Amino acid sequence: NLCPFGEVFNATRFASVYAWNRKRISNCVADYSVLYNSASFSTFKCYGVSPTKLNDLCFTNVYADSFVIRGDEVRQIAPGQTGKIADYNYKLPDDFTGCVIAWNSNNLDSKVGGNYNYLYRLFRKSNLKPFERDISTEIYQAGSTPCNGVEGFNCYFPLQSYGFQPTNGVGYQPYRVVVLSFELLHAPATVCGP
């Protein structure tokens, strides 16, 4: 009947970016201008698609991916970007079709002397493929000597903690992010809008 976007956008907890969450969305109708004309979205960028035109289109499947990153990293959530987040955590394909929605979540996801519950992957042997997810925590080998699962010189736990405090620069504050991706396949299209 109606696509459950409030379920995604208004969730209490958000995933860490390295463990980003995907909600599949099918067999429903929703107004996207509800979202575009919503409030306090500091980023609303679309690719291959216009927000207003989403009401006139039908897609086979629509995925809503959500996670939290730093403010200065929201720019990496875009086709063709590089950096720790795009390379190791959440990668959009070069020909991405969808929208990227972000908003500052400082006073929900920070803490007194720092919230250290959101993590990101700082090390990885190779870059992620688009929409790949890596939740492993194997020790990362930075030199010729193997680590054998022990942290030490050139042997690093691969995740790093976000230093989310109020009084950080706003570029360091947490932002929640939702990425909608749209796919039109041979099968019947069940996500349309009014």
Epitope: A142, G143, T145, P146, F153, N154
Partner: single-chain antibody
């Protein structure tokens, strides 16, 4: 073209301290870990420690009992080693060298060396080259053996050194050749027994040959085998 240019010789007397540099070029400095190796005159190679230049992380051979400290200067792409409380036993040639991981393992480029003149841990791996000198004839097939006191898998490298030069990397991962190394050189072995084989030995193979393990810290080297080549 990678280059590690080290600073010039030093003469000191007991109790004082030395700081030597290693200026790099030809590659992105922060992408490769730098190691330091000591060679006492006529003696074998000893690993001092390493430093990851991207984050400043470092480690040291406990044999040095804390007398070395490694630093880097990312701006000038330069690594430093400072030695303190120098004694008679610290006179040696000191090398910087680059860990080539993840492409060519172990020490794929070396500086030219810096002359400085004035038992181990129970779990340290000992690499034994039981032959110190071999004489063969041109054209022979030569086998240099190296035994590890503990299993080191295939994390073994071989180097070649001619007098007055830094070691030249020949073999890593027990059996792979570094760039530009002739096919006459092959390495074999796994576990604890390793061999370097030179097929059809030539005059330019006159050198001393060293094995090394990088399976565990401290990195350790065999004692070296000098190869003399006669007509």
């Amino acid at each position: 073209e990678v280059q590690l240019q080290q600073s010039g010789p030093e003469l000191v007397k007991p109790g004082a301290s030395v700081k030597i540099s290693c200026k790099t070029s030809g590659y992105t400095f922060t992408e490769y870990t730098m190691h330091w190796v000591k060679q006492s005159h006529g003696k074998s190679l000893e690993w001092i420690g390493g430093i990851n230049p991207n984050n400043g992380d470092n480690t040291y051979n406990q044999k040095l009992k804390g007398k070395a400290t490694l630093t880097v200067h990312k701006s000038s792409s330069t690594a430093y080693m400072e030695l303190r409380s120098l004694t008679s036993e610290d006179s040696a040639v000191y090398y910087c060298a680059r860990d080539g991981y993840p492409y060519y393992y172990a020490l794929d480029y070396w500086g030219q060396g810096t002359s400085v003149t004035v038992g181990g841990g129970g779990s340290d791996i000992v690499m034994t080259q039981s032959q110190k000198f071999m004489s063969t004839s041109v054209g022979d097939r030569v086998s240099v053996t190296c035994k590890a006191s503990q299993n080191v898998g295939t994390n073994v490298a071989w180097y070649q050194q001619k007098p007055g030069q830094s070691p030249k990397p020949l073999i890593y991962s027990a059996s792979s050749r570094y760039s530009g190394v002739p096919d006459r050189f092959t390495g074999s072995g796994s576990g604890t027994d390793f061999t370097l084989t030179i097929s059809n030995v030539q005059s330019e193979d006159l050198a001393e040959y060293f094995c090394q393990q990088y399976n565990n810290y401290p990195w350790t080297f065999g004692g070296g085998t000098k190869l003399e080549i006669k007509a």
